[PDB]
Design a binder for this molecule. Structure first.
Ligand SMILES: NC(=O)C1=CN([C@@H]2O[C@H](COP(=O)(O)OP(=O)(O)OC[C@H]3O[C@@H](n4cnc5c(N)ncnc54)[C@H](OP(=O)(O)O)[C@@H]3O)[C@@H](O)[C@H]2O)C=CC1
Length: 162
């Protein structure tokens, strides 16, 4: 399983349950990556989905109550069950597009970590938590140069190391 997330250089992920900055460029990449794979997105996150719904994709909506019905994605209230499901299908890749609470709960045990850095900065009421360098290491790093300083960003991939 792999976790994909993006955060501002200053230390911001979003605000009012929405993305203050618009980067369709990076978003297209994320959408393409999740193609042919099962991904789980938190309900609060779903509210931020700027390009919804997401047809022709195995998306699952995460909610507190199993009884609650969600459209476009399967509703599961058991965090442990999702993990076991992925374990059952090792061949299938798992990608998580939030929410932050979900990220935190599964932050301690993640096989693949995806980190996106933004050259620009945005103001918001949500700040990203501290990252343990010892817990994870970067397998490789990629540099992307855009005309606008804010547009330019660096993409890196981290994996668990013994
Ligand atoms: N740095 C980053 O890349 C990330 C950024 N973000 C940003 O944050 C926003 C979402 O974060 P935030 O608003 O704090 O809320 P979350 O998206 O983290 O909220 C998660 C929701 O999932 C459901 N849920 C949580 N825990 C469980 C559980 N144990 N069992 C079942 N369902 C569960 C709940 O739904 P309910 O209570 O509504 O039924 C809960 O409100 C996104 O819209 C985005 O803007 C989100 C993820 C990652």
């Amino acid at each position: 399983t792999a976790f994909l997330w993006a955060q501002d250089r200053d230390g911001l992920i979003g605000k009012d349950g929405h993305l203050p900055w618009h980067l369709p460029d990076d978003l297209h990449y994320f959408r393409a990556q999740t193609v042919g794979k099962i991904m789980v997105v938190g309900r609060r996150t779903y509210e931020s989905f700027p390009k919804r719904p997401l047809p022709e994709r195995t998306n699952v909506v995460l909610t507190h109550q199993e009884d609650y019905q969600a459209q476009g994605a399967v509703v599961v209230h058991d965090v442990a069950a999702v993990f076991a499901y992925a374990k059952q299908h090792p061949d299938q890749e798992l990608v998580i597009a939030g929410g932050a609470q979900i990220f935190t709960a599964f932050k301690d045990d993640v096989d693949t970590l995806l980190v996106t850095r933004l050259a620009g900065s945005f103001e918001g009421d949500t700040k990203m938590i501290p990252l343990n360098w010892d817990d994870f290491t970067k397998v490789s790093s990629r540099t992307v140069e855009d005309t606008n300083p804010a547009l330019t960003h660096t993409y890196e991939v981290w994996q668990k190391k013994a």
